[PDB]
RNA sequence: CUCAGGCGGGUCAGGAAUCCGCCGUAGAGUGCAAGGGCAAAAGCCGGCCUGACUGGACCCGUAACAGAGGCGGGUCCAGCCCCGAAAGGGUGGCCUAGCGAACCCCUGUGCCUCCCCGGUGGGGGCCAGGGAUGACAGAAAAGCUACCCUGGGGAUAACAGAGUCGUCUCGGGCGAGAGCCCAUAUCGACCCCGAGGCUUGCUACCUCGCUGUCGGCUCUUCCCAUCCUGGCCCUGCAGCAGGGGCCAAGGGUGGGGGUGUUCACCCAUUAAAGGGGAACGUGAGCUGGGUUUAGACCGUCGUGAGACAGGUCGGAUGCUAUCUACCGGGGGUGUUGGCCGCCUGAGGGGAAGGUGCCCCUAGUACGAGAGGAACAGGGUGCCGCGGCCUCUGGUCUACCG
RNA sequence: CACAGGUCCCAGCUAGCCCGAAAGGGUUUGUACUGGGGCCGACGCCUGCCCAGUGCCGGUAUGUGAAGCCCGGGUACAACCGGGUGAAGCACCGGUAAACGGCGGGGGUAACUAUAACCCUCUUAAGGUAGCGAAAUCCUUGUCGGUUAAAUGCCGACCUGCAUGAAUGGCGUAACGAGGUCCCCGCUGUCCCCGGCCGGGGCCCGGCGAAACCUCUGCCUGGCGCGCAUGCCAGGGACC
RNA sequence: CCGACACAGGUGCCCCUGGGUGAGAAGCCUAAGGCGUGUCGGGGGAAACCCGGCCGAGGGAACUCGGCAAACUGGCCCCG
RNA sequence: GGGAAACCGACAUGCCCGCAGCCGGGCUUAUGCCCGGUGAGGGGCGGGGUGCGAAAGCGCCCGGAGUCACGGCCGCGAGACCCGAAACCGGUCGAUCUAGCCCGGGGCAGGGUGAAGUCCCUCAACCGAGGGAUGGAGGCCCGCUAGGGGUGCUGAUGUGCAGUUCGCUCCCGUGACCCCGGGCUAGGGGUGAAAGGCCAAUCGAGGCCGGAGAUAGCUGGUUCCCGCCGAAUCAUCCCGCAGGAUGGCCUCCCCGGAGGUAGGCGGUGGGGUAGAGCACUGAUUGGAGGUGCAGGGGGCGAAAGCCCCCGGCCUCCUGUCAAACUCCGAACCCACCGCCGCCGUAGAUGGGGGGAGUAGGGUGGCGGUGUAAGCCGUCCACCGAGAGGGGAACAACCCAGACCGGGGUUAAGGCCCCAAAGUGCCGGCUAAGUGUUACUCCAAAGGGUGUCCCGGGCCUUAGACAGCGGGGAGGUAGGCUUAGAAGCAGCCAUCCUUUAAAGAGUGCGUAACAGCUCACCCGUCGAGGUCCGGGGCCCCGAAAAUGGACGGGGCUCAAGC
RNA sequence: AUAGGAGGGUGCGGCCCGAAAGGAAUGAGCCUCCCCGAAGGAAACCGCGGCGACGCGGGAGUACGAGGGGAGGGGACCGG
RNA sequence: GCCGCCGUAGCUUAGCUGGUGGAGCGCCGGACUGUUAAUCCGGCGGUCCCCGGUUCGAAUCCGGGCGGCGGCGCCA
């Protein structure tokens, strides 16, 4: 004669805390838009912005996959506490090529 | 035969007397003897019941049987005497019911909950002697074991043992 | 006056009835159940006789004690007989079943009475006997109702629960016997003892001023006697594959085809496609197919109305949350005078992970061959889970055509 | 359900049937091609058999059968008692099932294993015929086949039908149906598996403003207890 | 008017040939004519949830008692 | 007064007890007491009246108290403490709803198909064949025309917009169609394409009014207080068991008046239940010895034979045990007496009168049925209708029967904390957190070289208790059975010789000579040893569903047993 | 605004008042001395037992004790 | 589990107060017939289902038992 706390019901959705394993680190640079060397990365920043951001111009750094949170939002970056062991991490991934269209 | 959870009490009153009532069951027991004279043996071996009981016609039969079994193939029939003095007397009685569910009872209550014959048993008190071999001293062992293998068969249990009577 | 039955002699094929003797405390008989009574009798035989008589009581039973009608009986005394020599007995059958009212009618005898009075007819009445109510202390008496209606009842069924546990499930002991020899690898009769509450039944404790039925759907928790997974033991364990047992609920345990179906049957997959409880979980959530309304049909039954857990089509699913429960969100207090910002981590939660496949091992160990593992190191797939929209899909009542 | 069609039945009109307390009345400004009552329910093919039982109808020597009257008896009269006479009615006879209804059982037997075309027997009037049938048949998810990968379905078939059958209509049926059930093609958010959108509510404000119902209240779990508890008892959580 | 209510109800006729449309007294739009009292406003780009309704890849009833709901076809002309 | 009636017609007292009181004696200080007369009132006889009756014997009555009045209790009839429903019936009022019937009117876009009927051409002598037109029918189709209906959504609503609605979808839509106005038929009647439908928010017989305050054994309710006593929920009868009446029982008033006998002892009686058993009635189990006999198998059967043989019928010492058996038979219940006790003259015991209440439960005992729980008897503390204290709580287990207030001490039960009071004492058990739970709370057969402790045997240098070194004979392969059975499928015999010692063999091993090995034995190490059998206690057996819990915590030489 | 439930009874704290109907200044709550005193009833300390827990005798039926009486001080509320 | 009713010659059926026992059918031996069928004479077996009991005797009347026939197995 009781409720569980375990049963779908409304209430908030999102704007949780989440920490999110393994995420390859692709790329450090400063700048973007324009570099005077051609390999590892020749710069980044579509042109007219991103959509919802501000121009990127001082020092970035480019993650592989899903990051949690919304545009705009402060992000803190966390060392992993252990990477993963039947797939070996490898130094500087070789950067092939790069986006340089907009979102929209 | 439903299991034995009536007889096992001697609380449940009797309805002996076989003449009087009509409706009366047959026996399953009709070996009760075996072996030779009891003239020819000195030493007389007891299992003796320490617990009020009803001993069924079904249990009397069948544990005879596997303890006479055991002593007929080791020993032969040409030594030993083995003896089941009691005979059932206790009629027993039944309540009719079984499966039919549904609107159907099967059932009933009373309208005649009265027995019909399921069986005999014989009423075993304290100190009384459900079973007697008589055996000589070369012959002692086989007939302790026999005993034992009576007395799980027995309703509720033996406290007194098998026992060496010796022979008075 | 003494018997059933048995013995010896007799007749007969035997045997009967019949015959003689001996034994013989009751086994005979006494109408009829049963029980009780009884042997110079209540039985047996014979004679006589008709008291199963009239009248009027006491007492008991009926109906203990303890009110109670009808009926029965014992027991007196009076009258009239009977028998017996007499004493003496006979109020029916040795006792205990064979029982019948008010009112009515008929019978029989003697007697009273019928409205001013007598007589006659025909009446009423007192008494007794006989004639029925066996549903038997006596109404004069057929069914249906799902078209129902009412007064009520959980004093009482259906449903669920409780109790119980024949049945049901499971488990234990003993070990007849089989398994190639070998009870116990495995299989296991007869019989015996427990646990559970999961099937059925019993119960009537709760509920009939309604705790809404099943099944399904959806959503969530729990139990292990565990189907897989993990870790193990035995083996009639060569391998690969089983059988059987232990630990273990962390996780997993599906999709379809018929059926209203919980169950069950089948298909193809799968590691495995385990079981049971929660108002037979779940209707102030849905669904409403089925059960058990009111329409209708067929079969059976019934004279008929009308019926059926027989078959069948159709047949509504109400409510705006006062309290509390939880999910989420505010406003403030207490933390000892207040405050802006950063942390700790008592504690609470969890499955964030589960599981399979493949390659290497290895065509190797083992095996006659067929067949065919493991440790270990990799790659992936699905299920569950959380974030994310750049890619690629969806949409996009911005917008444009 | 009506229904067109079919059939049975009744009545010579001063009728039959039906209404009415009565007078009187309906049908009827009607007259058998009428008009009254039932059954069945278009068409197509058909509609076996039974009058034992029930029912209806016609008739009835005989028995029987009331009141009345008659005779006998009784009574000074009367009640009363007895007999004849005794109509419909009953017993009795015949007809009559498109009236209500019924329409059975065992055994034995055929080149071979099967069955029994075959032959016995008896109730109670007759003994299920043309048909149709596992059904708008229990057992039962019969069995076989179609159909589905897979179908307690549906359909076709067999058919021994627990408990079919001919106007209490049988069978079959073109056309027709907001009828019951099944299959196929297209199609498709019913589903795998849900998203986004839109408009009205929801939600807030302003104005307006009820109801159901009301012993009380911050519990949860177990035990107990009318055996299905927030309040008893023991723990735990617990600021509004 | 009647339904206690100024009730989405439902009660007769006549204008049934307005224009456009198109078979049309149909729909939509629009004219004469009438109204904005089918009588409470405003706000949140409005979240969950609920009603009406729009769109859904791939697959094409696997859902469910059941293709229920919904979809599809679509007018007209010709062939057949 | 008796008797149905006819009709008849009685004690203003003959006899005896004795309460109260009076009278007398004795006695105590007194009240008071013990004993003898007298004794109204009262009690018991006799004789009487009458009825039945030959008679007798009863029935009823008999030696003068009632009537009227007032208050109240109680019964019955009435509405009958109050309220409460479905009816029934009588007289009335509706067809403005709705049904059908009739008169007289009206409504219905558009479209399709295409019959009969009629015509013509071409081709054929005719028979006909091919084509086209015209006409226009339908209980006809399509259709969201108006209008009528209302299938699905089981959608929207479901304290509505609405006491029967809304939208989509859907049926009909020239008709057996719809509609207006007038007019007809009325309650066991109408009307019904007939559903028990409809006849004005009311229909398996409308509404209104009256009967009517119907009546219900049935539900609900029934109101100031206090004091005293204080139940039964049983019995018989009953168209009765959900109710009545009448008893038991409870309570109130009155009367008479000396005993009454719940308890215990003895005496005198009653008795067949426990138990027990063969003694009957008499059921049944098992084998000897009689061979007393009725007969189903065999034999020399020369034939029911002379003679034995085998189911068996029944004696005997023996053999199982017997609701409805008994040679017997307790405890125990019960009748009467005496005694003691107790109780009474502040009147008991008994009698009369007024008032009720007729669902039970429940532990235990003894049961009967029933696997059981339960049912149904019986007695039973108790609950009902009785608190308080304790068992955790807990209707009924324990303690206890309660006027108020105070002081005190114990019962039941408890003394580790919660929570008053013991870290009590002696001894022993226990290693399971057994248990810490007489309760409503409490699980078994079987089983453990688990402990602790009682028994009487074997046996100890005539030292196997375990190890350890060596053992392990001959007939004989036992024979049969059978291929083989050679100790070792199985059956049966299971004997005899010789000695450390030797089983016609314990297990392995072959299916079966073999092989490994044992019981066994001298024996080294040089001891206190092996058994068997009772008991207490702890262990296994022992798995369950939202949270598990001895009340909880926690306890382990105890806070346990 | 950290804390438990038939909403109360019984008993006692805090806060609050109370002139009035009550007793009390001819002395309230309160303090102190003395005595009588129902039922009940110790200790210290002494001697002797009991394996111990602890018990007896004496102290001692004393101290104490519900309840009752007198006196005395302080100075305003006490019940409710 | 309830409540009725059977069994009778090898089969099927009459029958019974308790003193009995048949029919049709099959079968067997003769006989017509050429043989045979049909037909036609002659026959026989029955503890009248088992098993108790009462009686002087039970096929019959009661108890029980066994197999076979109908009717309820439900409103709940």
Known sequence: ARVMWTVPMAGQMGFHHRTELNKRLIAIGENGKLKLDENTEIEITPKGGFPHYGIVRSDFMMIAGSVPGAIKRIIRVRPAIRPPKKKPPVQRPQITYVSVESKQ | ?168
């Open chain 2, 1 to 168: 035969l439903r299991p034995a959870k009536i007889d096992r009490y001697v609380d449940k009153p009797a309805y002996t007397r076989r003449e009087y009532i009509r409706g009366a069951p047959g026996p399953k027991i009709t070996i009760f003897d075996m072996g030779n004279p009891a003239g020819d043996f000195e030493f007389e071996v007891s299992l003796h019941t320490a617990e009020p009981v009803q001993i069924r016609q079904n249990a009397l039969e069948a544990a005879r049987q596997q303890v006479n079994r055991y002593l007929q193939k080791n020993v032969g029939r040409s030594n030993y005497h083995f003896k089941i003095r009691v005979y059932p007397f206790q009629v027993l009685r039944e309540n009719p019911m079984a499966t039919g569910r549904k609107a159907d009872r099967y059932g009933n209550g009373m309208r005649r909950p009265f027995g019909k014959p399921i069986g005999l048993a014989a009423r075993l008190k304290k100190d009384q002697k459900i079973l007697s071999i008589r055996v000589n001293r070369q012959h002692l062992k086989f007939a302790i074991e026999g005993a034992r293998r009576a007395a799980m068969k027995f309703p509720c249990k033996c406290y007194y043992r098998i026992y060496d009577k010796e022979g008075n």
